[PDB]
Amino acid sequence: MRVNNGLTPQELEAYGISDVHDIVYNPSYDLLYQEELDPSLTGYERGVLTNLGAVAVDTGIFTGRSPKDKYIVRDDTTRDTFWWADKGKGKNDNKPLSPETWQHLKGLVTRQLSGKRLFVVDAFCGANPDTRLSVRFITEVAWQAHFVKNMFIRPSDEELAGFKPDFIVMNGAKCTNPQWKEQGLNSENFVAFNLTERMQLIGGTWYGGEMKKGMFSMMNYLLPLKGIASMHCSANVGEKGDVAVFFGLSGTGKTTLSTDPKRRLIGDDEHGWDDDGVFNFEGGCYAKTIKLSKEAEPEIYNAIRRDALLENVTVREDGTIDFDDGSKTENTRVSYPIYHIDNIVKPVSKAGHATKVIFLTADAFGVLPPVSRLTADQTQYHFLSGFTAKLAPTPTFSACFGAAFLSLHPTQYAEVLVKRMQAAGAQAYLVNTGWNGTGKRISIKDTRAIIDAILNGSLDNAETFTLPMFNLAIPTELPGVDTKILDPRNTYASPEQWQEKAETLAKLFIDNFDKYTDTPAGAALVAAGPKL
Numbered sequence: 001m002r003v004n005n006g007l008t009p010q011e012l013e014a015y016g017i018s019d020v021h022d023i024v025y026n027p028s029y030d031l032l033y034q035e036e037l038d039p040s041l042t043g044y045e046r047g048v049l050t051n052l053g054a055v056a057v058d059t060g061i062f063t064g065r066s067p068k069d070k071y072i073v074r075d076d077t078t079r080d081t082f083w084w085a086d087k088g089k090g091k092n093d094n095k096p097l098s099p100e101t102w103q104h105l106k107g108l109v110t111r112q113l114s115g116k117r118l119f120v121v122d123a124f125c126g127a128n129p130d131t132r133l134s135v136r137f138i139t140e141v142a143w144q145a146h147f148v149k150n151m152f153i154r155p156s157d158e159e160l161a162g163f164k165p166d167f168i169v170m171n172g173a174k175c176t177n178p179q180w181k182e183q184g185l186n187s188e189n190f191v192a193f194n195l196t197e198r199m200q201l202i203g204g205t206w207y208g209g210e211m212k213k214g215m216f217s218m219m220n221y222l223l224p225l226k227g228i229a230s231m232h233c234s235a236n237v238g239e240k241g242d243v244a245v246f247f248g249l250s251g252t253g254k255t256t257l258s259t260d261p262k263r264r265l266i267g268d269d270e271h272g273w274d275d276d277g278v279f280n281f282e283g284g285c286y287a288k289t290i291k292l293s294k295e296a297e298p299e300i301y302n303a304i305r306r307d308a309l310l311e312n313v314t315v316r317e318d319g320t321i322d323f324d325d326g327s328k329t330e331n332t333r334v335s336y337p338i339y340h341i342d343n344i345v346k347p348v349s350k351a352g353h354a355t356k357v358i359f360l361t362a363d364a365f366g367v368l369p370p371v372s373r374l375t376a377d378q379t380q381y382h383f384l385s386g387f388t389a390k391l392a393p394t395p396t397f398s399a400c401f402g403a404a405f406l407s408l409h410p411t412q413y414a415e416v417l418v419k420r421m422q423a424a425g426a427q428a429y430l431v432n433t434g435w436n437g438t439g440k441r442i443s444i445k446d447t448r449a450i451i452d453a454i455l456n457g458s459l460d461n462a463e464t465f466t467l468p469m470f471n472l473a474i475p476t477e478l479p480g481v482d483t484k485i486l487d488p489r490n491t492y493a494s495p496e497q498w499q500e501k502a503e504t505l506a507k508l509f510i511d512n513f514d515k516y517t518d519t520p521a522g523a524a525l526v527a528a529g530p531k532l
């Protein structure tokens, strides 16, 4: 277990874990590679070697998060501050848990990990020492340890020297809860959090995303309370120091579009915004691999090598991967340490204040324009709305473009965001990476061209006009982009086709925003939304 930094069995005994004979502290990438490739492994622990040099694993019955199994202990520390599922007006997954049931779940996990060979990985959540969390991850599955090593900030030998955990996550994926029915829970699985004890317990599900998004939820709780923005976005910097953030729901393009060879990548999913600027919470990127194209996305493709971890992909007998196959799941992914991307911010993932705020959305209705410059009020309206539809039309409204990870009320996030934007004189833009009248998704080539026009200032100097109903300012023409697609009405046989669909989508926005009108501030924002 590494050098002068290891843990004693007496220390694990304090967490409630007993009889641990073999401890693997701070595992190296080489050891992880050996553990995963052990030919005697059976089941979901087993990994396979691909022709690209990266190991591939299957995450079990769960290939994505399970929000129905997410619980937060309601006590005197979280009672008056948490955005509870049974008290507010907005729908959320922050279901309350009694301290007594928590104790029951903690016993299940500690017993499951007792008498086992354990992996212990210490890491940081947050690039800044003043607001970061020192997290200790405990697991009995090698690839899960690999996932946290990739996704979180890897400490230096000196940092490990005086490492003191302020948050502990015990992954007991192999165990389940037989008393769930009598405890009023959703199922035998569970993803629980206790802010008094500062711990996260996982049971039944092997999916690594629970640990990643679980800690994101905790940052989303602590930071805003300190006046710091906690955002679900990707980010990069230009040579001039111009920072751009990209908000959006899953599959909208945060990871694909931020990985721009012309710009230095800061992060791809979770960032904070304080008095000094934007900073990454993580130490790696988590890319989607369905229908992955080497030609269209070379940087992400080249990141798939030894130390990267493929998930639920289909591998053929000859070691080759079939990226197009989504039989196991459409949520095929690969995690990798951030340095697998050549052009990144080093040695610390952070930069100055963002001046360009981009909201990405995949509109399956084919109504919204490819690009539009938003007003201050429209920015707040769309942020709270958090729109997207379908994949590859069913609407989805997720506040702040990430409601599933919010620990506080949505307006609290909007407040701090506006605060930071006004101070930096930031400008907002709405980008539709989705569909139009053709019934096909806009090309990644055209989308990248649009992003370039935003960053280089072409869009800010372009001649614009107003799109009816949504009242969005759209450019008459844009360098490197096809003029015909800029106006969504042009993609249909007749502008009346767009009209019918536009009215349908407009009504969906109006109905959804109705829950924010219970305050004078939210009532004033309705004027910023679409109007028949």
Ligand SMILES: Nc1ncnc2c1ncn2[C@@H]1O[C@H](COP(=O)(O)OP(=O)(O)OP(=O)(O)O)[C@@H](O)[C@H]1O
Pocket (backbone or CB within 6 Å): 248, 249, 250, 251, 252, 253, 254, 255, 256, 257, 269, 286, 287, 288, 289, 290, 433, 434, 441, 442, 443, 444, 445, 447
């Ligand atoms: N025009 C387009 N713009 C962006 N992505 C596109 C476009 N056309 C197809 N895609 C595909 O859509 C997906 C976008 O995924 P990406 O990983 O960027 O989503 P994300 O917003 O980062 O999701 P998550 O929040 O789950 O991490 C990729 O598979 C990408 O190849």
Ligand SMILES: O=C([O-])C(=O)[O-]
Pocket (backbone or CB within 6 Å): 064, 065, 209, 210, 212, 213, 250, 286
């Ligand atoms: O599971 C998720 O949504 C993730 O981590 O991207």
Ligand SMILES: [Mg+2]
Pocket (backbone or CB within 6 Å): 254, 255, 256, 268, 269, 286, 287
């Ligand atoms: Mg992503």
